[PDB]
Design a protein around this nucleic acid. Structure first.
Lengths: 56, 119, 229, 115, 122
RNA sequence: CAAGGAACUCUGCAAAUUAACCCCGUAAGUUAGCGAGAAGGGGUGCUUAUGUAAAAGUAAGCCGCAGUGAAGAACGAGGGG
RNA sequence: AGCGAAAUUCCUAGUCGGGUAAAUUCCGUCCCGCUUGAAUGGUGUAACCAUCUCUUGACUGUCUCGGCUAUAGACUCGGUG
RNA sequence: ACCUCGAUGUCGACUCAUCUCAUCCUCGAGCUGAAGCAGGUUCGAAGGGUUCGGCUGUUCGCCGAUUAAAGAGAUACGUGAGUUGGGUUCAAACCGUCGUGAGACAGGUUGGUCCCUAUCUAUUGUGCCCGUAGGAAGAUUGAAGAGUGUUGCUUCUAGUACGAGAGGACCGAAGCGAGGACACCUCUUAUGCUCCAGUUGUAGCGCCAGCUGCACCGCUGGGUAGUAACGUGUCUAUUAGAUAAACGCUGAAAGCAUCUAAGUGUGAAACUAUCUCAAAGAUUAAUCUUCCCAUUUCGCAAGAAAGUAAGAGCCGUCAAAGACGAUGACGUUGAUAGGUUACAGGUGUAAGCAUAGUGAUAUGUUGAGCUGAGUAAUACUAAUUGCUCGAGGACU
C-alpha cells in the first residue's frame, strides 16, 4: 500500500483534466438587476416577484 | 473507533424538528438547510391540520411537539395558533406553507432555504 | 422455434390455492394489448423478428421521430419500442390477447429486471463465505481471504481478467424458465404466473415460450370457496 | 397506465369468505378439517386458542394450538383453504392481539371468558 | 438449522430417554434435519431398566421439530420440541405404545405399523 | 437474532444464562478455621386493613406477559500436578 | 528410603482399566526407571491461586449462517490540509 | 553455492481456489479364468464433483461414521501491502541431562507482538472528451465472448432376460433426493432506532389525570413498509454436426483375405453450435427506420447575422434509481415529490364522561384511538414570469 516512485507532472495534468466545476443555471431577474440562478432567490433581496429578503 | 462526536441521531433530528416548528409557530418564517426545511414542512402541515380540529386532546397531542420560549410560552403559543393561525387554512387541503431557496451557507455551502406561510 | 411473448409489469405477488388442497404462489402482472410497430421478415430485414410499440402516451408527450413513424404505420403514441426475435404470427398494428398467445396450464419463461442494489460486495453477489470473529481475528472478518495468484520472481504476479468481485448488482434483466402460467383476465388486461418473478414496482416483464417446454401443457388445478354465511 | 394495485383483491374476490367470526387471538375455537383418504372423508377437530393473526386479505394466517398427550401442537391455517370448517366456541376479553406467552403455559387455569 | 450431535428425545417406551443425531442419513453435506427425516443417531441416555443401553449407534425417525416447517398446503405445522422414535432395523417399532402426535405425510414412506399405535395422526 | 447449543477453533479467545433483597437448604473431607454464598431451589408490584418507631412482617383483594419490572450485578461441578 | 512413561521415559500412537461410535489430548495401573529419587530435599498433603490442565452442566451468532437497524468513518460538498 | 542475504516473510489452520491427467467418481467403449448380480483389465475422456467429526500446532498421520466415489501432483510444499501466532526460532521460569561453568540439548513444559493512508500495471462496476463519416432518436444482426454443461435413491415394465435352482439384469418412464447458482418477496423467521403500545423511577410540565427529558430504542409485548434468509420457485436439458477410444460396411494391398488407401457410416457428459446473458472503441467504429435542417447575401457559404425547428444539457420535484456519476418519470396546459382527503394495515376498545367500587380495579361511550414507508383522487406548496448547446452537408 506504498508507492515505489513519484508522480510525473504531465500524467498529473492528464489526471487533473477531469477537474471541472458544474454549470450554474442562468435566470432573468425582472424587477431588479443581476440576472439570478434557477431555483434561487433573485438578486434584489427577493425571490423574484416577492420581496422578503435582505443581504445583511 | 474510539470516542468521538455522535453527529446526528434520529432522536436528535426529531428534537431539532420540534425546536424549529416551535420557532416557526412563534414567528411564521424559518431560514434553515433545504433538507431540514423540507423535512419539517410535512410535520408542520400535519400539526396545522390537527390544530384546525380545535380539540383539547389535539392540544395535548401538539404539546409533545413544541419547545417553550420566553416570548411565546406553550400555552400562549398554542392559544395564538388556535386563534389566528388555524382558521385561515380550513378551505385549503394541505400546502399551507412554501419553501424558497436562499443562497448557500458560508461555512459549509449548505443549501439554505426559507420556509414561510402561504394560503 | 416460433416465439410467443407479451409485455407486462409485476404489480404484486400473492398466493392462490388449488384443488387437492395445496397452494400456489402467484405473481400478478398487468398486461396490455400491444400495437405492433413492425414485423421484420427474413426477406425484408434479413431476419424474422417483431418490433412492438407499447406503453401508450399522449402525442404531445411524444417525440417527433416517434410520431412520424407512428403515423407512417398509423399507430398510437407509445413509449417503448422493443424487438422480439423469431416472431411471425402477427402483423403491423394488431392488438394482442393472452389467450391467443398462451394456454391456461402450459410452461413459459419470463425475462424480468432484477432489484437494483447499486454497489454490492462480492459476498452477496456470488454468495461467498465470511470468516469468523472468534479465537482472534483482528479487523478482517468479512474480507477477501486469499487473493495471491503468483509469488516469487515471476509466477503470475497479476489479477487475471473478470475476477469475481464487487460492483453493480441488480437493475438488470435475467430470465427464469419452466414457470407455470396460471390464468388471464382480458377485461382488465392482467395475468397470473407461478414461482418467483423479478422486478420492482414499474418493472419490465417479458413473457415468452419456454425453450425446454415448447408446447407441453399440464392440468393446473383450481380451488374455489363456496362457504359463506 | 392508470393503476390502483387493487387488482390484488380483485382476483382475490373469488376466494374471500364472509362467515369468519370475529377472532384474532384469545378466543377458544375448534376447527373441523376434512381429510380425504382417497375416500371416506374423515373429520379432524383441532381445538384451542389462536395465538397470531398475521397477513393481509387472502394472506391472513392464524395459528391454532392444541395440547394433546402433553405435547403442544401448533398449526398455521389460512382462511380460504378448502376442506376446512371454522367455528367459534367461546371468547373472552382481549387486551392485546398478538400473544406468545400462551405457547408455554400449563393447565389447571381456565382462561378468562366473558358471557 | 441443526447442529452436529444435536440432542433429542424419544416418544415411546423403548427403554431410552436421550439420543443425539450423529449423522444425517443419505448423501452428506445435506445439512438438513427436518420432520420425517430418518437419521443415524447415537443413544446418549437409555435406562438400564429398559431394553436398550447408551452409546450404541442406530437409526431413528424424527417426529417433532422445535422449528417445524412450512407445508405445500400453505399450512405451517410447528412443534415446540425435538424428539424421535426408534425403529428396530425395519419399518416396525420397538415401543409397545407410541406417545405423542405424528404426521400423516409419511404414509408413502411406510411406517404404517406405527401410525395406528400413535395416540393420533395429523 | 430463530433452530440447534463448542458441532469453528489446540483451546467456551470473545459474547453469553446467574447475581441485588428475603425464605430455605446444603454433601464429602477436614489440620475444626473451613468447606460453602456449597450444590440445589423458591418468593420480591399495587391497593385495603393489621402491624411498631418507621417498617421488616401477616392476611384479604387488583392488574400485568412479566413486579432487583428501567441503571449495577456470583457462572457451576468433578480430577490431577 | 519413597515414588514413578511421571512437565523428567528414546522404545510410545508404553501396556491395561475408564472416557472416547471417533481422544500422538486426559485420569489411575505394571515397574529395566537409557539420566525417577531423599535439604539440588523424596513422598503425599487441608483451603487457595488474574497457576498448567482435562471431563462436564446452564448458557449462547465461536460453527450452520449471515443478515438487519442505528450512528461514526467512508461517499458527495465548502474550507484547511 | 547459480541470480538474491543495504532482507529473497518462510510451518500450520481457515478463505480463493485454479490448473493437469499419469481419471477417483459420473460417462462411452474393448477384452476376460465376464451365467446374472457382482466384477477385473484397458483406451478415450477435465463437462461436473470428489463428506464430516475426535486427537496431536498440524497439511502428515491414527480412528470413527458416511457418499456414485469420499483421487493424486503443482502454484515461495500459493495465498500475513487476508486473518491466527497455535507448536516451531523471543526474552521469563522450570523439569531430566550434559558440561566444574559461562550455557546448551536436532529433549520437553509454562505462557509470550504480527506495522502499513494503493503511486503504477492489472482487475470489478463505473461515468467523462472524441468519433463512428450532414445532426439526433432509436431498432438492432452478431465478428468476437461469459455462464451452465453435477449426480444418486425407490417403484413399473421385472423376480423378467440371465441363471436352474438359488440369486439376479440391460433401456426408458414416474416419484423421491443431495448439491450449488440465479430470482423472489405472498407463506415462515430475523431486523424493522421519528409505527402501535403496557410501561417503573427520577427530574419537570404550579398539582391530579395525562404527558415530556434520561435511565439500551429506559424495560418489556408486538409490528406497517422496507431489507435480508432459516421461508419459496427454475435449473441439472434436448437436438443436429464434428467426433475420441471403439464398433463398422464395400474394397484393394498380397485376385483370397481385408473398418483404409479412395469412399461410405455409427459412436463419449470431452468439442461445435442448439440453452441463458451482454455485446459494433467489433477502427471492419457494421446494418436498418424515422425525425430535423438547407432562410437574401461575402473567402471551399468556408457561420454570414438567425446557428435545429429534432432533441439534449444546466436547475428543480423526485426513487423505481441512487457511493458520486449514471437510469428513468415529471416539470405549471405540470399529476413529479411532498401536503390534504378517502381506503388499507397492524397496534389494539384512545382520552374524557358515566356506572360499580372504600380499593387496587372492572364495563358502556368504542374494534374504538393511532400510525416512517402500503393503495389511490385533489393541484394545496414546491418542480419559475429561466439560460445554453443543438441545422445549411463536410467529398463523390
Amino acid at each position: 500500500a506504498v508507492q515505489q516512485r513519484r508522480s510525473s507532472k504531465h500524467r498529473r495534468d492528464k489526471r487533473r483534466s477531469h477537474d471541472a466545476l458544474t454549470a450554474q443555471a442562468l435566470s432573468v431577474c425582472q424587477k431588479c438587476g443581476k440576472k439570478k440562478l434557477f431555483h434561487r432567490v433573485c438578486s434584489c433581496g427577493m425571490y423574484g416577484d416577492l420581496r422578503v429578503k435582505k443581504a445583511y | 473507533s474510539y470516542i468521538n462526536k455522535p453527529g446526528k441521531t434520529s432522536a436528535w433530528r426529531v428534537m431539532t424538528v420540534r425546536q424549529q416548528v416551535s420557532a416557526v409557530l412563534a414567528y411564521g418564517k424559518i431560514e434553515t438547510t433545504l433538507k431540514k426545511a423540507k423535512n419539517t414542512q410535512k410535520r408542520l402541515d400535519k400539526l396545522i391540520t390537527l390544530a384546525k380540529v380545535d380539540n383539547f386532546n389535539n392540544r395535548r397531542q401538539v404539546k409533545k411537539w413544541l419547545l417553550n420560549t420566553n416570548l411565546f410560552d406553550v400555552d400562549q403559543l398554542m392559544d395564538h395558533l388556535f386563534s389566528k393561525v388555524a382558521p385561515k387554512y380550513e378551505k385549503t387541503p394541505g400546502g399551507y406553507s412554501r419553501v424558497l431557496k436562499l443562497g448557500p451557507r458560508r461555512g459549509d455551502a449548505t443549501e439554505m432555504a426559507i420556509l414561510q406561510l402561504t394560503d | 422455434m416460433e416465439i410467443r411473448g407479451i409485455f407486462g409489469v409485476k404489480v404484486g405477488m400473492s398466493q392462490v390455492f388449488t384443488t387437492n388442497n395445496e397452494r400456489l404462489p402467484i405473481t400478478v402482472i398487468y398486461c396490455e394489448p400491444n400495437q405492433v410497430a413492425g414485423v421484420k421478415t427474413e426477406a425484408k430485414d434479413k431476419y424474422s423478428a417483431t418490433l412492438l410499440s407499447f406503453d401508450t402516451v399522449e402525442n404531445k408527450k411524444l417525440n417527433k421521430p416517434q410520431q412520424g413513424f407512428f403515423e407512417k404505420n398509423n399507430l398510437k403514441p407509445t413509449k417503448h419500442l422493443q424487438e422480439i426475435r423469431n416472431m411471425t404470427g402477427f402483423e403491423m398494428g394488431q392488438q394482442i390477447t393472452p389467450q391467443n398467445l398462451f394456454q391456461v396450464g402450459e410452461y413459459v419463461d419470463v425475462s424480468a429486471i432484477s432489484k437494483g442494489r447499486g454497489f454490492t460486495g462480492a459476498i452477496k453477489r456470488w454468495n461467498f463465505k465470511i470468516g469468523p470473529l472468534g479465537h482472534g481475528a483482528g479487523y478482517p472478518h468479512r474480507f477477501q481471504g486469499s487473493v495471491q495468484a503468483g509469488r516469487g520472481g515471476a509466477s503470475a504476479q497479476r489479477v487475471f481478467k473478470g475476477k469475481k468481485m464487487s460492483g453493480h448488482y441488480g437493475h438488470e434483466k435475467v430470465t427464469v424458465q419452466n414457470l407455470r402460467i396460471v390464468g388471464f383476465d382480458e377485461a382488465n388486461m392482467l395475468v397470473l404466473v407461478s414461482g418467483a418473478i423479478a422486478g420492482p414496482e414499474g418493472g419490465v416483464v417479458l413473457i415468452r415460450t419456454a425453450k425446454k417446454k415448447p408446447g407441453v401443457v399440464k392440468p393446473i388445478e383450481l380451488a374455489v370457496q363456496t362457504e359463506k354465511a | 397506465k392508470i393503476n390502483k394495485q387493487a387488482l390484488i383483491d380483485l382476483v382475490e374476490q373469488k376466494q374471500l369468505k364472509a362467515y369468519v367470526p370475529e377472532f384474532s387471538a384469545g378466543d377458544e375455537v375448534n376447527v373441523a378439517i376434512k381429510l380425504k383418504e382417497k375416500e371416506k372423508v374423515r373429520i379432524q377437530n383441532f381445538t384451542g386458542t389462536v395465538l397470531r393473526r398475521r397477513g393481509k386479505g387472502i394472506s391472513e394466517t392464524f395459528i391454532v394450538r392444541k395440547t394433546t398427550d402433553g405435547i403442544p401442537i401448533e398449526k398455521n391455517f389460512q382462511i380460504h383453504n378448502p376442506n376446512i370448517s371454522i367455528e367459534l366456541k367461546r371468547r373472552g376479553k382481549v387486551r392485546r392481539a398478538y400473544i406468545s406467552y400462551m405457547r408455554e403455559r400449563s393447565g389447571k387455569a381456565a382462561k378468562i371468558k366473558e358471557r | 438449522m441443526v447442529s452436529f450431535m444435536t440432542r433429542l428425545n424419544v416418544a415411546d417406551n423403548t427403554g431410552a430417554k436421550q439420543v443425539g443425531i450423529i449423522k444425517v442419513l443419505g448423501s452428506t453435506r445435506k445439512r438438513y434435519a427436518f420432520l420425517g427425516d430418518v437419521v443415524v443417531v447415537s443413544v446418549k441416555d437409555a435406562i438400564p431398566s429398559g431394553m436398550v443401553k447408551k452409546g450404541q449407534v442406530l437409526r431413528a425417525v424424527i417426529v417433532r421439530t422445535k422449528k417445524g416447517q412450512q407445508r405445500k398446503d400453505g399450512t405451517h405445522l410447528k412443534f415446540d420440541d425435538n424428539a424421535c422414535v426408534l425403529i428396530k432395523e425395519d419399518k416396525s417399532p420397538r415401543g409397545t405404545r407410541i406417545f405423542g402426535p405424528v404426521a400423516r405425510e409419511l404414509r408413502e414412506r411406510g411406517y404404517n405399523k406405527i401410525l395406528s399405535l400413535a395416540v393420533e395422526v395429523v
